From a paper:
Specifically, the [name] is responsible for the post-translational insertion of low-hydrophobic transmembrane helix (TMH) of TA proteins, as well as for the co-translational insertion of the first helix of some multi-pass transmembrane proteins into the lipid bilayer. The [name] contains two distinct transmembrane cavities - the hydrophilic vestibule and the lipid-filled hydrophobic groove - present on opposite sides of the complex. Here, we present cryo-electron microscopy structures of human [name] in apo and [name]-bound states at resolutions of 3.47 Å and 3.32 Å, respectively.
During cryo-EM data processing we identified a second major class of particles that contains an extra β-barrel-type density adjacent to the transmembrane module of human [name]. The human [name]-VDAC1 complex has a 1:1 stoichiometry and measures a dimension of ~220 × 130 × 90 Å3 in size. The transmembrane region is composed of 13 transmembrane helices from six [name] complex subunits (EMC1 and EMC3-EMC7) and a β-barrel pore of VDAC1. In particular, Glu73 of VDAC1 is buried inside a hydrophilic pocket formed by Lys112, Thr116 and Gln117 of EMC3. By contrast, the entire TMH2 of EMC3 is ordered in the [name]-VDAC1 complex, consisting of two helices α1 and α2 joined by a short loop. Collectively, The VDAC1-bound state of the [name] likely represents an additional function of the [name] beyond its primary role in client insertion.
Numbering used by the authors:
A (entry chain B): 2 to 297
B (entry chain C): 4 to 261
C (entry chain F): 11 to 110
D (entry chain E): 2 to 104
E (entry chain D): 12 to 24, 41 to 122
């Protein structure tokens, strides 16, 4: 397939696919380096501005994959033209961290901060160095420090939430996800994650909040089945708890039964695709019947 | 149609002038890009900008947020005991704009005096060709524009339709005004008329002229705004239909795995 | 309709203005090639703009609500600046051929 | 498809230029003869209009973008798995690195 | 409950976060409505165009009666601005 793939492509499509990969910031270092070094030996003629980003991406992938030789090969090419560039310094520091002797990388970051006071990338890389070197508490403190000094980056908020997830701190992650959702209200993914975080907390009021947040993002995309499943189980759990009112429990049963029918239709519309989908449809059917009998 | 002209004056005046103004505009745009220099930004001002953006985003998107957390945000901003905006105070520069003077200045400044450099170019071009007839404009004109239009031909019986090179280039300036953006893009800075006028998107959007006053203004704006949980209305989706998830699910089969 | 993206709106407006200026530029060349009076020329320019707007509406057809919120910019947009650039190319080839 | 439209636009522009040259020759002949205040032939005028209408059809097709107004549709396919990873924080400590180290 | 069978229960064992607050501090109720000063500001912004006429009169008298490119261009944009502001009066009227 390697020769077959290399045959039925052109350099334009390959470059466009690499640009799309950059846009989707996926983790495909193997394929990135596979298509990276191939276009560096086949075309190697024009598109300098594109090929510099390509060089950096290929070296980033090679740092992940297995190959420091190509990483240094692209590093010398990057250093040839721009003698003083802080991005290349950051990249070299990252590779140095990957190899050994983290302290000289820290010193390089310190010098970079001494030159340019406003360098978020170097501080982020130092925060990541102490995420893996020491405990996550100190890294959390420093990430909070940098975030307080900026209060600009959404990636910092999401990283803080991710690090707080491992510490079973849903109270602070709740605020993190609330802030990250406030800036982007049309992104249903953050709403779904916030609903899951609030559901994990527990409590009937938190259950209702998570249910409503599940149902809000359910109409923005109208296809995510994780949120619909979470809403159905939130309604079932509300029904289970004795501390409830008659009409609220009634409407919760209606919500759960409606979600069950939507599940049934979603799985029945997939049965005409293949011939093994009928069996999975049966399986989810027994699941829903058991849950319906138990709820009723 | 009269005044039979030579075929040598059209190939030595029209084309040269057109190319001259085209390349002058392009050169002006490129030089404007080259001369653009960055402005130094200090960390405290950056933080002030980010806090302003945060408060503005809270003002805009405040419906899809829990009431308890919204009140916690608003208290943190207001906080009558300490107050972030109340205590944090930077240096203040003495102002000078006044109500009536600035209300008038809004029009006094304007862009009134931005035509003179083009007039200089037109004057040089007209100086080069003293007695010349470039073209005629089909649009009928009044005889009171002839002094400005001809400006160098001694003719009182002739109509004002026949224009000189000065007005020819003057109309050439605005003829390609919307054509320059066609090859460059929406943000075009090749306008020959506005030479000295700086036209750009603008480095460093945030301009906290008086940090304290902006702090107080945002403090009162956040006190004025109310809270209306737009999430409380979930019953509209309750009674509905789900057919779009049937929608591209049909069109999600057709794509395989690379 | 609740949430709107400025990038798509800007792109739509840019495309609309680009076609409006190109059609106007060619309308100027046609009138300069033929050669008419001012009243007839202005009427012809208006007719060309109307034809361009009709073709632009025909281009969208269905599902136009998602593309354009309204239709006022489609009908009335770039009528003065487009005329300013059309008058140039009208007289550019008018006197080049006839007078010269 | 875009190449066909571009070629059609070019052909129409060439036809328009040829019609302009024909009209110029007609007026040059007219200046030779006294009086005879007649108009240019209607056939070349119709050719000019045909070249004008054809070139205005591809000029609209060449630049058609018409992006969707709603901001939810582009992120309707994007998965949270890709969003979970970020380009700022990348820890270079994985089992694949030591698995790919020998080879 | 035994009804759900599979139910995983997850427990949780200096104030640096600005948002996460230890004390809940509810009981916020603000009722401030000053329509008089808002009406006063809206009454005066619509008076600016009226006061923008006398200075244009002064600069028109200043141009004189010499037919030239500069005075003609000054007059051409002097009436264009009111017309261009007249083309979108409906939106600001609704506002």
């Amino acid at each position: 397939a390697k020769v077959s793939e290399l045959y039925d492509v052109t350099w334009e499509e390959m470059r466009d696919k690499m640009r799309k990969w950059r846009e989707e910031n996926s983790r495909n270092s193997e394929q990135i380096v596979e298509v990276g070094e191939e276009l560096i030996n086949e075309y190697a003629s024009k598109l300098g501005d594109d090929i510099w980003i390509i060089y950096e991406q290929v070296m980033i992938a090679a740092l992940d994959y297995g190959r420091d030789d190509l990483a240094l090969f692209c590093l010398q090419e990057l250093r040839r033209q721009f003698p003083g560039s802080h991005r290349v310094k950051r990249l070299t520091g990252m590779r140095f961290e990957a190899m050994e002797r983290y302290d000289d990388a820290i010193q390089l970051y310190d010098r970079i901060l001494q030159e340019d006071p406003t360098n978020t990338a170097a501080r982020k890389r130092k925060i990541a160095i102490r995420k893996a070197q020491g405990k996550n508490v100190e890294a959390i403190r420093e990430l909070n420090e940098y975030l307080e000094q900026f209060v600009g980056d959404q990636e910092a908020w999401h990283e803080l939430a991710e690090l707080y997830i491992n510490e079973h701190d849903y109270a602070k992650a709740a605020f993190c996800l609330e802030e990250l959702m406030m800036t982007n209200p049309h992104n249903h993914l953050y709403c779904q994650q916030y609903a899951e975080v609030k559901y994990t907390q527990g409590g009937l009021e938190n259950l209702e909040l998570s249910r409503k947040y599940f149902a809000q993002a359910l109409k923005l995309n109208n296809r995510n089945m994780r949120a619909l499943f979470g809403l159905y189980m939130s309604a079932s759990h509300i029904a289970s708890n004795p501390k409830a009112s008659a009409k609220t429990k009634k409407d919760n049963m209606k919500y759960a039964s409606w979600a069950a029918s939507q599940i049934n239709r979603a799985y029945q519309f997939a049965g005409r695709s293949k011939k093994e989908t009928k069996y999975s449809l049966k399986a989810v059917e027994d699941m829903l019947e058991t849950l319906q009998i138990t709820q009723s | 149609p009269e005044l039979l002209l030579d075929s040598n004056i059209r190939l030595w005046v029209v084309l040269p002038i057109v190319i001259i103004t085209f390349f002058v505009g392009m050169i002006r745009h490129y030089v404007s890009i080259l001369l653009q220099s960055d402005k130094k930004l200090t960390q405290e001002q950056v933080s002030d900008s980010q806090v302003l953006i945060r408060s503005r985003v809270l003002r805009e998107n405040g419906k899809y947020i829990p009431k308890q957390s919204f009140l916690t945000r608003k208290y943190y901003f207001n906080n009558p005991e300490d107050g972030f905006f109340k205590k944090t105070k930077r240096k203040v520069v003495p102002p000078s704009p006044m109500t009536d003077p600035t209300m008038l200045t809004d029009m006094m400044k304007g862009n009134v005096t931005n035509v003179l450099p083009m007039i200089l170019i037109g004057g040089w071009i007209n100086m080069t060709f003293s007695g010349f007839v470039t073209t005629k404009v089909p649009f009928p004109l009044t005889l009171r524009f002839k002094p400005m239009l001809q400006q160098g031909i001694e003719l009182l019986t002739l109509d004002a339709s026949w224009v000189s090179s000065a007005s020819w280039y003057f109309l050439n300036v605005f003829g390609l005004r919307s054509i320059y953006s066609l090859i460059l893009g929406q943000d075009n800075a090749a306008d020959q008329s506005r030479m000295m006028q700086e036209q750009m998107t603008g480095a460093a959007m945030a301009m906290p002229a008086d940090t304290n006053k902006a702090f107080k203004t945002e403090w009162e704006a956040l006190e004025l705004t109310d809270h209306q949980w737009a999430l409380d209305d979930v019953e509209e989706e309750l009674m509905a239909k789900d057919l779009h998830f049937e929608g591209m699910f049909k069109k999600e089969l057709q794509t395989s795995i690379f | 309709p609740p949430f709107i993206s400025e990038a798509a709106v800007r792109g739509n407006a840019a495309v609309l203005d680009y076609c409006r200026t190109s059609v106007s530029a060619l309308s100027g060349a046609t009138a300069g090639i033929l050669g008419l009076t001012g009243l007839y020329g202005f009427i012809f320019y208006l007719l060309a703009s109307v034809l361009l707007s009709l073709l632009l509406i025909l281009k969208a057809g269905r599902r136009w609500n998602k593309y354009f919120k309204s239709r006022r910019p489609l009908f009335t947009g770039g009528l003065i600046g487009g005329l300013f650039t059309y008058v140039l190319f009208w007289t550019f080839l008018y006197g080049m051929v006839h007078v010269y | 498809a875009p190449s066909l439209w571009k070629g059609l636009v070019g052909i129409g522009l060439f036809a328009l230029a040829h019609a302009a040259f024909s009209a110029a020759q007609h007026r040059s002949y007219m200046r030779l003869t006294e009086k005879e205040d007649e108009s240019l032939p209607i056939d070349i005028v119709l050719q000019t209009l045909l070249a004008f209408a054809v070139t205005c059809y591809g000029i609209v097709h060449i630049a058609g973008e018409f992006k969707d107004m709603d901001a939810t549709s582009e992120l309707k396919n994007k998965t949270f798995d890709t969003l979970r990873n970020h380009p700022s924080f990348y820890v270079f400590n994985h089992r694949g690195r030591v698995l790919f180290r020998p080879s | 409950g035994r009804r759900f069978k599979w139910a995983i229960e997850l427990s949780g064992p200096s104030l640096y976060p600005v948002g996460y607050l230890d004390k809940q501090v509810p009981d916020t109720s603000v009722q401030e409505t000053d329509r008089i000063l808002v009406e006063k500001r809206c009454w005066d912004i619509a008076l600016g165009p009226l006061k923008q006429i006398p200075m244009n009169l002064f600069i028109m008298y200043m141009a004189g009666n010499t037919i030239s490119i500069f005075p003609t261009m000054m007059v051409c944009m002097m009436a264009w601005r009111p017309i261009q502001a007249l083309m979108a009066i409906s939106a600001t009227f609704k506002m």
